Amino acid sequence: MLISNEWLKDYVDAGVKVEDLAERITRTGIEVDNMIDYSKDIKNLVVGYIQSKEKLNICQVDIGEEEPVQIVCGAPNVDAGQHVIVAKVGGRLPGGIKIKRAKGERSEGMICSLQEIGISSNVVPIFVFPTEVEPGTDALTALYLNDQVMEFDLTPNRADALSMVGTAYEVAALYQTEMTKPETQSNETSESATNELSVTIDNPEKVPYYSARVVKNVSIEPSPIWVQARLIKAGIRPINNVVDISNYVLLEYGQPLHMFDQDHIGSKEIVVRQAKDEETMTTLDNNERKLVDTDIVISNGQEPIALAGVMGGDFSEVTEQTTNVVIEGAIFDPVSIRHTSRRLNLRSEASSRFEKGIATEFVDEAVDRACYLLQELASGEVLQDRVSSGDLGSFVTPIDITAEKVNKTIGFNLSNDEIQSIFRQLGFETTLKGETLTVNVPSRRKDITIKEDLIEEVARIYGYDEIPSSLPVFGEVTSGELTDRQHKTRTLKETLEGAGLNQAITYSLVSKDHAKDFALQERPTISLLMPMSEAHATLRQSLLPHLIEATAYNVARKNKDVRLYEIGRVFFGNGEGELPDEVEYLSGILTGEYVVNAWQGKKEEIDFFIAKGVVDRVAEKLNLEFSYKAGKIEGLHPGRTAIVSLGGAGIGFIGELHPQVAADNDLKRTYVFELNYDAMMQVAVGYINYEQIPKFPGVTRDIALEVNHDVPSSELKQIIHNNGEDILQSTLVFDVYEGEHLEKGKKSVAIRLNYLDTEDTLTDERVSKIHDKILEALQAQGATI
Amino acid sequence: DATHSHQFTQIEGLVVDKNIKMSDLKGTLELVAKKLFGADREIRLRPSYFPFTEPSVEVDVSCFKCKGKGCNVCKHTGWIEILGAGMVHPNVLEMAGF
Amino acid sequence: GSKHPLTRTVEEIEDLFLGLGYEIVDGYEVEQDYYNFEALNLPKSHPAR
Amino acid sequence: NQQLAEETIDVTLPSRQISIGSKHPLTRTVEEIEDLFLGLGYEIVDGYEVEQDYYNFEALNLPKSHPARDMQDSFYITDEILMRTHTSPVQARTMEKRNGQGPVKIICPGKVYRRDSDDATHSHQFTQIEGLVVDKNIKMSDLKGTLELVAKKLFGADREIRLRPSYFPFTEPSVEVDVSWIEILGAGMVHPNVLEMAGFDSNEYSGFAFGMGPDRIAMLKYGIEDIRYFYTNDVRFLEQFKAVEDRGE
């Protein structure tokens, strides 16, 4: 919302520089996020008067000095008798540019266009003064552009400030001086618009107010320069005295007004009702519009003659050959207006105002402003009365509040008389009754409805600098602690990090064809309705796609050693209109060297087993046990992928990337793991189980088992445990041999068997007894010693 | 772009009890600015509006770079915006069951 | 390996609040209009919905 | 084609372990208790292990005459200086520096020394956590509340505890807490001579204090059979303490 300094002092004078006024406004609630200086770059610019004009054109401008100056000018429409805008020798301008005695003939100073002086696009309507202004007069002064405009970024609760008068009430408060509203009283013809005009709402649920006055006999034309500049300042190209007088009083009161030509309305009756099924009409757009149940129209008595709120009709509007006018001032349900405008891409500065809600206080007065104006500036003549439908109601809503309550919310220490002064300087009538103030809030502040709102007004004005500083004292005493899950997650992240893995943080949203990568179940994916970006369109069902990308990215930057982990959520769809299942995952990815010290010949490449070693360090730290079984996961190496299980359930996988995926991403051998961290965190582990150190030594036997090349070592270890009765403690593969010294398709797996009795020392013979049983079980399952 | 990501991180707080005041907010926001920017940090509370809170403010920390009179971090302002805060709005309390 | 700088800041704020008696709470990232907006005093109307 | 078949691994083969060290079980119990008290607003304070008899005894309401100051039971170095016998002197010194102004709410962990022969339940150097709250209306119910939180943190919330009147020089009234029955915490309302000596006004300020012994807590919690295991550092001992713990199932 753009607010001209010059213009505002019609209603209030802050007796202060526009910077000072922006500052104080910003420091009390409404942010002035910029200040436009229309006088932008401007030095020595005066009215002048072309006395005579030769032949671009040699002009003799009286610029209010003892002698005329001679100015050469080849601008399109220029002659003598014109009062013009002259930037003298030694002056300055926008665009660039600064102007001196030039010569050819002899040229002293510069006569001006508008734009030249610095207007804009889409908002402009050499420059000639419609009025005979004194040569030598400061020119911007005369042009009402000796001015700076404040641009506000206003919030929904400050609609009041969408107006010059509402903003004037605000500023009158801030400087606790006075504001004045502008002339509304016209001189009225004997007759009344009651005799002219009929108004009914068939849809009063959606239209609280509609009303109309009539002003007869009007002189379409241009508006004075003030009306004109102001409109340009306020962002709107000044069109003609009657398009202006509407848009201007919009800016002034925030009450939108419609202008109908009486004689081209098409009756002496107006009807506000809903549009119907598919209902046809063509709007002063000349673009034809078929409607819906849920649009408000205006009609004459069987003619959709205006899309209420949004637009007008073709035919009933004001053309320049109009000479009588009905002026609308209505209230249209904020959301009906919102959805029409919205859909037909038809946002006006006047629908936008119906969106925010209207000052009830102001409807009739705003109407009366545009009628007086039409009087004053379209020589128009003003009928008595209005034809209003539907009741506006009270213009004061009273709210009680107490000082205690105010001090109790903020924690300062204000008296009733301090508090009372604030409301009275906001222009609210207040009455004290014991300890309670009754605050008559005007309809012009529709964002003040409750005592808390009134608290905010006091807070903001008296100032937040003032609020002392305290800390809340909680009478339910409770020790703040990480939960168990939270604490485990921090410790786990310390463990990963301690093993060299950097914490990644990736985007949740991937591309739609990536969203199911590495997923376990077929589960539906969640896509956005309107992605900003094809690459961020659907919620990932896996952490890996973006971790792989981050690895590719790093590697292309010649960061060859990448170790990253992430704990992060993935998303599976719960059919339609339910929240998805959000599941927390731990994942990571690894490539390059794990250990390097070149000068000592140390170079340990990351392989599957070091990736395994990371997933095991996780399990170890959390006091879990995982198991591992070959799995086939699309996108992983078929030969180097394991499924990780906890309590016999699959919780994840670890695998080298498929050679084709790695090649696509220009990576070397790269390892990822993904684990359902929710599954992991559901396991209650309790306290650590302490067992005293065994009193007696154990016995180790090694065995070398020839077995078909595809038997997993887990299988042999299980057979051994199955037969190990009470003393078999653990088993360790320490060598696998496949080569020429052994039947092709066989491997030899060497396993160290560790035996232990916590209650006794082991006789060779007790060990041999079980060891022999284990050998036989193995031998019978195809495992030759 | 350099200053906008479509996915970012936030930390909110909510404290609701019987005599909570805006001075209690202030004291807490102050511990926050100290925690983040140093024991000598002051804060500044500027009027503002959010729909869920009322009164509302935006909160600056004093600049931890330049000690006073301005630098490029605080944009020769001395104050850096870092928080928004406010007293929760009744409608929010009442809708929650309070 | 490193802790992500965003996690570091989040942890120090949690620590501060823990020592004051607070709880750290997590919930859904995909959410319903009711909780995201309505429950937070943005009626179906509003410019942020 | 054969590439993938020739690069088949046995994914069940030993992983390349990246080993984790353990936090000492005494340290674990300490940290846990600190974290509990942090979230209530306390400060963890650390002080001297070798102390003046003023701070270790006198300031604690054990005058020259006391059986506690017996050279046979404590590790003196001169007649005035000794290995501290508890972390109370740090609490007494912290109090004095406060200069009559509360609140004090401090927790003081550390090694303490007792002139005794070591056996399965006695180490001449062991650990202790003491706490001190001093504030204007501290009452014994406030003590009771804090003690139940401690027990709840150590042994879980359903663990049954027992409060028994008792007696210490530096507190009155005083209390012992058993856990289901085994003694773990000693505590009391700080004796006014103790407030008065470290410069508080016992008409304005009351206090409560407590001690417990992580060596003992840990032995009890895990069934560690010999306290000296804590100070022997056999890796077969320490490695049993790598993993996280929860409340449980």
Ligand SMILES: O=C(Nc1cccc(S(=O)(=O)N2CCN(c3ccccn3)CC2)c1)Nc1nccs1
């Ligand atoms: O008051 C305490 N703490 C305190 C209170 C009661 C019990 C214990 S305890 O169980 O750990 N204890 C250790 C000492 N033992 C002693 C020591 C000497 C005499 C008698 N008994 C008993 C058991 C500690 N310390 C203070 N510091 C500063 C001001 S008050």
Ligand SMILES: [Zn+2]
């Ligand atoms: Zn700075």
